[PDB]
Amino acid sequence: SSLLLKKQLADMRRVPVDGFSAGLVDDNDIYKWEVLVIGPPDTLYEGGFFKAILDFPRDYPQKPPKMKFISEIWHPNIDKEGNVCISILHDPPEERWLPVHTVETILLSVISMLTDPNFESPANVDAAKMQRENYAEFKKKVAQCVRRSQEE
């Protein structure tokens, strides 16, 4: 558990998932990660430097970590509390969380979330509703989050 995370964190830092920077909030606690999420190119989140925190249970492999975004972000799948809500974090097929999954898997499915939001019961309707009909003001609000992430 603590061995797997140390290994995963280390690979992460040597060869990161392009656009992701991982570190520890407390150097003596491998269960709380601070991750810099740079807005992927060709998405409304482009120049964004969104900070986030990963909470890993004591039994990581077979139990998804919780991902909470710090740093204002306007997304259908991120609730009003920054909590990211996506399938692969869910946990009682390949959709949900598997024990063979890694931080890498999570981070990858996160680029997907930002690039292609999944409505079907969004964790943030205000946003879900907005991008669908009032696309105008939506891009305008994502920009507000991107402009704010560049000055913090």
Are 37 and 16 within 8 A, CB to CB? Answer: no
Give the experimental resolution in Å.
2.5
Sign of CA dihedral 123, 77, 151, 55: positive
- The DSSP output letter for 6 is H
Question: Kind and range of the H or E element at 148?
Answer: helix 135-149
Q: From residue 99, how far is each of 38, 58, 108, 116, 122 by CA, in Å?
A: 27, 13, 16, 25, 25
The span from the CA of 75 to the CA of 39, in Å, is 12
The method of structure determination was X-ray
The CATH superfamily of 1-152 is Ubiquitin Conjugating Enzyme (3.10.110.10)
Q: Is the distance from CB of 86 to CB of 77 less than 8 angstroms?
A: yes
Type and span of the H or E element at 110: helix 103-115
**Which residues fall within 8 angstroms of residue 55, CB to CB, at 6 or more apart?**
31, 32, 65, 66, 67, 68
The DSSP letter of residue 88 is G
3 state DSSP class of 144: helix
Which residues does the annotation mark as catalytic?
A: 85
Q: Where are the beta strands (DSSP E) in 64-110?
A: 66-69
Strand partners, 54: 33, 67
Q: In terms of Cα–Cα distance, which of 130, 104, 105 is closest to 117?
A: 130
CA angle 62, 123, 68 (to 5 degrees): 55
Q: Where are the domains of the chain?
A: 1-152
Rounded CA-CA distance 146/71 in Å is: 10
